[PDB]
Ligand binder design. Structure first.
Ligand code: F43
Ligand code: F43
Ligand SMILES: C[C@@H](OP(=O)(O)O)[C@H](NC(=O)CCCCCCS)C(=O)O
Ligand SMILES: C[C@@H](OP(=O)(O)O)[C@H](NC(=O)CCCCCCS)C(=O)O
Ligand SMILES: O=S(=O)(O)CCS
Ligand SMILES: [Cl-]
Ligand SMILES: [K+]
Ligand SMILES: [Mg+2]
Ligand SMILES: [Mg+2]
Ligand SMILES: [Mg+2]
Ligand SMILES: [Mg+2]
Ligand SMILES: [Mg+2]
Ligand SMILES: [Mg+2]
Ligand SMILES: [Mg+2]
Ligand SMILES: [Mg+2]
Ligand SMILES: [Mg+2]
Ligand SMILES: [Mg+2]
Ligand SMILES: [Mg+2]
Ligand code: NA
Lengths: 548, 442, 248, 442
């Protein structure tokens, strides 16, 4: 069967993919491009309206001396210019982040204990349902106790709500199903049983605050907003005095003792509060992505959906905007979710492993790392050598390094069933690549790469951590493109091969199994394509409160 | 001595120990027992060996509800605790027979660790205690069971948690009374970021000892912050003495006189009477059926008023055996005494202000919690410069079981380890003995 | 010194570039003035600008390390630090990015070398840079079709060659002339037009490129077949891995 | 005693001082001069009296370009510096004959302040130095000129800046080599958050002394972080000795042999020869015309390689008299030596990795800057556990004036004050002398 990237290469270029020569400088620069043409015209209009020059194709160097390529969004039949995958231009990408940023998980276990002990009242599915009706009025920003309150417009905050889940089926079934994330409905049988056993009789809220608020404010707003309206709803639904000593236990429980943030806060040089991208560990990112519960018979698909999720969030939005900005890092990320390239390399590796070892049956050791990561690295590099069109497509060494090493690392973890040896395979891939082509990435690409082998199995204070627990604030990882989303993939890989329901936090996994989200986390790449086509409908807009 | 003042020192039963001790014998800068307490708090760590073992066995590492399927390791840590602790001790110590302590508790389920003082002498701060302890136990466990290169990172996660992806040791199975330096509200705040429940736990709910430990920590922080330098030093020392060390038996005697039937108001009346009797205040002038009091020694008035504030908390929250009303006592003792006298309240309004926000943030939806989760570094309760939090410690010591977030709930690991240390558990004893010992060198 | 393991021509060429006792083959003659023009930092006849006074004019205290380390001539003079940057085609250019940085810190004094996939740079004192740059331009470090002198807009290392065998250049600094079969540099390295172009000679033919290249490829010598070179890379991975864990 | 290794120690002219010194005599945990340096850096503050005066006269307080019209105060602070400094000293000291130092510099424009060590003995961390110093000078200025209650808050703003609205002392006219505890990348990092330019400034650009001070600070931090506990301790001690203290004159002799005409590559060749001559490495295997080297002592190979790395920086950046290429040296010394030998590079790749990112962040748009603004706490340069930053200090010492953000630009106040202190300025001298003194107590 053809290599999975061949269709995309034939779409991009007139030459066959194997052809070594082409002709440049005859395409009219930017004029070859529908999108650049749109931008030139828009810049003229913007500048004329506001009285300050803006986009101008004649500033600096002339884009488009070569072909300005379309990209296939991998697993789709959608081909778009890369500008349509810039997070600024792609409402699906923006909404993916808003849906994470505006979510927190908040237990009801301490809260219900406070109710039964301290207030001496009973909790049943019926009282929980009444509480949930109440908090779904209050959470978007509406009142339940005071006179003369002024409130948020319901239609501006239609995306905000609260659901619950529990591992106890009989309890779940007694709560009004409008409010319940039904684990048995959303997960295949074996995964559902794993997840229900993790949760047990615990009861957890999934709280989503309004996108318009999240965009006005920041991620650290989420758990506070959540807690205020949980607090008001506990007062109203359980008939408390409206501000007594017990009220503070609900606040402490909802804000601290049983809250799970999506991201933890960051140190001062990169100061941020909770629920910002740098605080989201790789294992959580894999669990937020919902490919695992749909595509479970295909561990490559699951792993590469996680890579797409993470490459976009971590490289485009986080490193490319929060930590830098400007034109940013679209194609550093698109390399990992376009043209079915990473897919080709990773299916090669999975098949190699299946045949030699069987998934998850290789020894978890350095022999396996050396074997698998080397073989897969050489396959990927050979494709760039065999197909000049492929090399011209993934033109930046960093892009190639990330893609080849992601395939090598995922494949290694498919073999061992362990993310840490997967990680070792990622670094070996870099080292081999660097020697093969006498180049790797950009100036600063392999800071973590060169520290990498030694820090995989270290146990020291700021060095040692299982990969699932690492994230964008792991010291070596804190700066550079072309790694973080790929690491989320490697984190997913052994778990997908094992058939595990989750990678690092079962509550996070369940919390995104929800079709009331705006973004469809089951099909991240499909959503990116929809956004690229300007077909995605985000929350948070102000149309209702602005002129027609 | 810089100051002329002398105080009489009493024990936690209200009995005289030593008369006419120079005030500065109680100073954090001079008193060797306060130095030993502070250095002990810097260097002490509680290790939960049971917790480490269970995290490993279940692969539940890295924070609440987290788990890595397939990473489980079944290691008999508690059954080999003696060997593991000895091996850890060899790495933690600097020299044989130095002041390193590693003691097993609970049948090997817990260890008390005191990292040698010499490591802190050449350290900037206090994080060597958890970091040296953590790596010594990670290495000792790896070495005990010959844990492989491939698996050892799970031991690290079980001991210290999600650090360094998280800033904190998120999910760790070690504990300290101090918290990380990044969480300080301001430079110099570290001895303030010690939960009230931890203080109550360490002192086994002995009311006067909890008040003393809290006051020692708070007023020692006031020196580190520079607040107790120059013009303010005597105020802070007198506050330590009279509010936290029961100087002149004033707190004890006010409680004795008001405990049977008294209220916050009756304690105020007694304190004003005592201040007048001792010449601390005097009538400055007469309005219509109202005496305006003045003072020639504001720091001493403040200290007397602070003793009365402590006594008022003990009487009000001791009568209720319920801590919540400490926020009210801290407010209205101060509000009432100003309109009773025409003199400023404790800390010139800052206890009252702290109490307003503390009341709000312990009876509302917005933040805070019960009294025991506050501390001098908490945004709600940082504002008074040592004169509020010790009363909260006294109140929580007197709580008979009204709190969900009790010391039993928040501070059990801390209790088991830190209450073993005599100077932490009974600081009033040791600080008074040390003051008496150095009285003729001040 | 050993420099690099392996038994391929690639490996030997990598060793040769690093070895300061290996005489780099000179392929073309370039005048001093034309090297200055290509660099584009100053005009011919312009005095070297300075960033600080001559070391002689400074009043430096005793320092045993300074006393033992002879400054390069441009440091003595107080010259600015300036650069020359090259892009090398993955279609068998003789030099390649890590080859250059490794070689530069074996051969040249006082050197700030940087490696990237699409560009490789050296920064040093200006008069010394001019001498080094002559060697970088005249010798087998450089082919005028498959390598480019580029201080910006570097794209091309990974692109298909054009019909003349020339690497892509967004700014077209090097022009192949069919009538001589020779390449001319028509702009300096930052892209400003030269009054008079600089002859860079003929592109190396396919056979000679293959003799001289330092890139491993399936259609040349594949890295996976230089088993001794791979062995050392894998060894370093394993020894680093073990050392980070427990110093064994 | 714990380790058998002995080293020969030299002065910064390459002359023998003491042979056969036990390795642990250089340990931060044992060497009294390292203790003195570390405690000195915790306790020392530079006060810019001229700066305070000018901020007040113009009402330019609270950070860059800030000013409050109408708040100007014209006080003759520098003209009354002796009185002000003496008054501040009275508040700063604990007792009159303690180790408090307050010394005027620059005709009273600056003061060197060393806050007494006893304040740190009863402190959690190091912020007492700026906070006690700041309030003592604020109070002394107020008292000197009888500044009113209404105006005194301007003196406070002129001394300590926008704190506490800002977390940092934003706009302050005092300086320390340390920075605030909240800025630590991790617990244990405070001795790493010391700008390279500050180290170069304090050591008056003496290359070996700058390398020594940086290494002392970095490797002492490795103890506070727990990195030099247990399995790693000897590696860190050998690194301190050979890379930062010129043990066995190895750095010095490599520079001597390569200084006239050498390169990074020629230093590598000499170091490999020397390692082989000394039995640190040995040929393990013969490939085709290629010797694969091995070692039975990875920590010693690492230390030898680290000495070569320092020498390579001195030769490469010394020849250019331009610091920027230190990022390149740190990368390619390590890259080259691995392919030269088959052995791992310094810090098992972590220097090389640090160097990759440091190169990027000193030659790109994204962050960083020139070599002198980095430090062991910087996100770019934290990754190697002490083996990279001292080379950056050496390179900046050797820079003849190519940097915009030079020590003259960033560190003038630090230079004037901290270079006065002999142990800060010439640490190699004092640490070697202390090691020789305690050699028979190890
Ligand atoms: C439950 C609390 C305790 C607490 O922690 N917060 C509450 C409630 C909270 C809720 C009320 C929303 C709702 O009704 O569902 C909100 C809007 C915060 C939120 N969660 O969004 C709020 N208060 Ni409150 N709260 C207010 C106020 C006040 C005034 C109202 C006094 C009166 O006579 O009506 C009093 C405090 C006081 O007595 O001074 C007050 C109390 C209280 N405040 C009592 C409920 C009082 C009651 O049972 O009626 N708020 C105000 O004084 C005005 C501004 C007003 C806020 C809304 C706005 O700014 O538009 C609101 C601010
Ligand atoms: C000025 C720098 C130095 C620096 O600090 N950043 C730059 C430029 C910056 C700009 C370029 C935007 C513009 O043109 O105005 C942006 C987009 C960041 C921003 N400010 O928005 C960027 N790089 Ni760069 N940069 C990239 C890359 C690269 C590759 C390109 C090699 C090639 O052969 O084309 C090389 C590094 C290398 O050689 O490995 C590179 C260099 C460089 N990168 C050189 C300029 C190179 C030149 O003169 O042509 N980037 C890539 O390798 C791919 C992704 C791409 C980024 C944009 C995206 O992700 O869509 C972009 C990311
Ligand atoms: C106290 C503190 O809360 P915690 O006790 O830390 O939960 C803090 N909140 C606040 O200060 C709430 C301020 C806004 C609502 C009350 C307005 S009067 C915060 O969330 O950081
Ligand atoms: C290094 C550091 O910058 P500073 O040196 O503190 O200016 C840091 N930036 C970054 O890490 C930039 C990361 C994104 C751009 C480079 C991607 S390879 C930051 O802004 O906090
Ligand atoms: O050229 S650099 O590697 O500095 C930046 C690449 S985006
Ligand atoms: Cl499937
Ligand atoms: K926002
Ligand atoms: Mg085609
Ligand atoms: Mg115009
Ligand atoms: Mg029913
Ligand atoms: Mg529904
Ligand atoms: Mg849908
Ligand atoms: Mg009596
Ligand atoms: Mg009475
Ligand atoms: Mg010539
Ligand atoms: Mg063949
Ligand atoms: Mg006055
Ligand atoms: Mg031979
Ligand atoms: Na342009």
């Amino acid at each position: 069967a053809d290599k999975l990237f061949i269709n995309a290469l034939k779409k991009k270029f007139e030459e066959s993919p194997e052809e070594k020569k082409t002709t440049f400088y005859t395409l009219g620069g930017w004029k070859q491009s529908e999108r650049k043409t749109e931008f030139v015209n828009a810049g003229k209009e913007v500048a004329a309206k506001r009285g300050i020059p803006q986009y101008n194709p004649d500033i600096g160097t002339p884009l488009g001396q070569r072909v300005l390529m379309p990209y296939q969004v991998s697993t789709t039949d959608t081909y778009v210019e890369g500008d349509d995958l810039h997070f600024v231009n792609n409402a699906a990408m923006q909404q993916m982040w808003d849906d994470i940023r505006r979510t927190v998980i908040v237990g009801l276990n301490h809260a219900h204990a406070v109710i039964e002990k301290r207030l001496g009242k009973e909790v049943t599915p019926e009282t929980i349902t009444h509480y949930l009706e109440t908090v779904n009025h209050a959470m978007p920003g509406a009142a339940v106790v005071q006179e003369h309150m002024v409130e948020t417009h319901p239609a501006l905050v239609a995306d905000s709500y609260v659901k619950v889940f529990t591992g106890n089926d009989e309890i779940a079934d007694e709560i009004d199903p409008a409010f319940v994330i039904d684990i048995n409905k959303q997960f295949p049988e074996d995964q559902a049983e794993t997840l229900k056993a993790e949760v047990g009789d615990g009861i957890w809220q999934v709280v989503r605050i309004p996108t318009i608020v999240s965009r006005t404010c920041d991620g650290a707003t989420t758990s506070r907003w959540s807690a205020m309206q949980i607090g008001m709803s506990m007062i109203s639904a359980y008939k408390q005095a409206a501000g007594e000593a017990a009220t503070g236990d609900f606040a402490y429980a909802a804000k601290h003792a049983e809250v799970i943030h999506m991201g933890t806060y960051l140190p001062v040089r990169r100061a941020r509060g909770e629920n910002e991208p740098g605080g989201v560990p790789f294992g959580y990112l894999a669990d937020i992505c919902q490919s695992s519960r749909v595509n479970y018979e295909d561990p490559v698909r699951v792993s590469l959906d996680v890579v797409a999720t993470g490459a976009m969030l971590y490289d485009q939005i986080w490193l490319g905007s929060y930590m830098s900005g400007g034109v940013g890092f679209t194609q550093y990320a698109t390399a990992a979710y376009t043209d079915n390239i990473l897919d080709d390399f990773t299916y090669f590796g999975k098949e190699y492993v299946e045949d030699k070892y069987g998934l998850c049956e290789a020894p978890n050791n350095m022999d396996t790392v050396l074997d698998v990561a080397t073989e897969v690295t050489f396959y990927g590099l050979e494709q760039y050598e065999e197909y000049p069109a492929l090399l011209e497509d993934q033109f930046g060494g960093s892009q190639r390094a990330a893609v080849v090493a992601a395939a090598a690392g995922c494949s290694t973890a498919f073999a061992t069933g362990n993310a840490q040896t997967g990680l070792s395979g990622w670094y070996l891939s870099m080292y081999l690549h660097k020697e093969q082509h006498s180049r790797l990435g950009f100036y600063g690409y392999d800071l973590q790469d060169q520290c990498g082998a030694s820090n995989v199995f270290s146990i020291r204070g700021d060095e040692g951590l299982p990969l699932e627990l690492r994230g964008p604030n792991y010291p070596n990882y804190a700066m550079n493109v072309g790694h973080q989303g790929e690491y989320a993939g490697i984190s997913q890989a052994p778990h997908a091969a094992r058939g595990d329901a989750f990678v690092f936090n079962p509550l996070v996994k369940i919390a995104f199994a929800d079709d009331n989200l705006v973004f469809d986390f089951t099909n991240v790449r499909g959503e990116f394509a929809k956004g690229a086509l300007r077909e995605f409908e985000p929350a948070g807009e102000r149309a209702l409160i602005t002129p027609a | 001595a810089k100051f002329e003042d002398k105080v009489d020192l009493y024990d936690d039963r209200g009995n005289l120990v030593e008369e006419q001790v120079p005030l500065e014998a109680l100073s954090p800068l001079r008193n060797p027992a306060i130095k030993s307490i502070v250095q002990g708090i810097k260097r002490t760590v509680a290790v939960n060996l049971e917790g480490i073992e269970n995290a490993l066995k279940t692969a539940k590492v890295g924070g609440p509800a987290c788990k890595i399927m397939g990473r489980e390791l079944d290691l008999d840590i508690v059954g080999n605790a003696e060997s593991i602790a000895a091996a850890a001790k060899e790495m933690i110590q600097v020299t044989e027979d130095d002041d390193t302590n590693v003691e097993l508790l609970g049948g090997g389920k817990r260890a008390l660790v005191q990292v040698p003082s010499a490591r802190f002498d050449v350290a900037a701060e206090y994080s060597a205690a958890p970091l040296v302890t953590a790596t010594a136990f990670v290495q000792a466990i790896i070495n005990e069971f010959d844990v492989s290169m491939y698996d050892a990172n799970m031991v690290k996660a079980a001991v210290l948690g999600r650090y360094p992806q998280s800033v904190e040791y998120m999910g760790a199975n070690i504990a300290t009374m101090l918290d990380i330096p990044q969480k300080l509200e301001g430079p110099g705040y570290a001895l303030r970021n010690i939960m009230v429940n931890h203080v109550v736990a360490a002192t086994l709910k002995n009311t006067l000892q909890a008040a003393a430990l809290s006051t020692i920590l708070e007023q020692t922080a006031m020196f580190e912050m520079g607040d107790a330098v120059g013009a303010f030093e005597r105020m802070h020392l007198l506050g330590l003495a009279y509010q936290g060390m029961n100087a002149d038996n004033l707190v004890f005697d006010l409680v004795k006189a008001n405990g049977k039937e008294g209220t916050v108001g009756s304690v105020i009346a007694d304190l004003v009477e005592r201040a007048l009797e001792d010449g601390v205040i005097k009538v400055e002038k007469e309005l219509t059926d109202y005496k305006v009091y003045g003072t020639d020694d504001l720091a001493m008035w403040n200290a007397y008023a602070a003793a009365g504030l402590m006594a008022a908390t003990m009487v009000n929250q001791g009568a209720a055996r319920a801590a919540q009303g400490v926020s009210s006592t801290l407010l209205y003792y101060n509000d009432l005494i100003e309109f009773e006298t025409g003199l400023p309240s404790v800390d010139f309004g800052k206890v009252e202000g702290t109490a307003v926000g503390f009341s709000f943030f312990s009876h509302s939806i917005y933040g805070g919690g019960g009294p025991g989760i506050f501390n001098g570094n908490h945004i709600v309760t940082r504002h008074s410069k040592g004169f509020a939090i010790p009363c909260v410690a006294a109140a929580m010591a007197l709580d008979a079981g009204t709190q969900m977030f009790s010391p039993e709930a928040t501070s059990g690991l801390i209790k088991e380890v830190f209450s073993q240390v005599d100077e932490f558990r009974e600081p009033l004893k040791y600080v008074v003995e040390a003051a008496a010992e150095i009285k003729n060198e001040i | 010194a050993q420099y690099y393991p392996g038994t391929t021509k690639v490996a030997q060429n990598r060793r040769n570039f690093c070895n300061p006792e290996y005489e780099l083959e000179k392929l073309r003659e370039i005048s001093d003035e034309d090297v200055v023009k290509i660099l584009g930092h100053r005009a011919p006849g312009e005095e070297y600008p300075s960033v600080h006074p001559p070391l002689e004019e400074m009043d430096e205290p005793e320092d045993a390390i300074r006393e033992m380390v002879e400054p390069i001539d441009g440091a003595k003079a107080g010259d600015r630090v300036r650069y020359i940057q090259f892009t090398d085609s993955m279609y068998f250019a003789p030099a390649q990015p890590y080859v250059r940085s490794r070689a530069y810190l074996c051969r040249y004094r006082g050197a700030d070398a940087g490696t990237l996939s699409g560009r490789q740079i050296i920064e040093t004192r200006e008069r010394d840079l001019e001498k080094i740059s002559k060697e970088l331009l005249e010798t087998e470090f450089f082919d005028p079709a498959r390598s480019g002198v580029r201080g910006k807009s570097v794209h091309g290392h990974s692109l298909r060659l054009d019909e003349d065998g020339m690497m892509f250049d967004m700014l077209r600094r090097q022009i192949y002339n069919k009538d001589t079969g020779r390449v001319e540099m028509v702009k300096n390295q930052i892209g400003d037009e030269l009054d008079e172009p600089v002859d860079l000679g003929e592109p190396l033919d396919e056979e000679t490129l293959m003799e001289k290249t330092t890139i491993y490829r399936v259609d040349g010598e594949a890295y996976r077949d230089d088993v001794e070179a791979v062995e050392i890379m894998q060894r370093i991975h394993v020894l680093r891995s073990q050392g980070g864990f427990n110093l064994e």
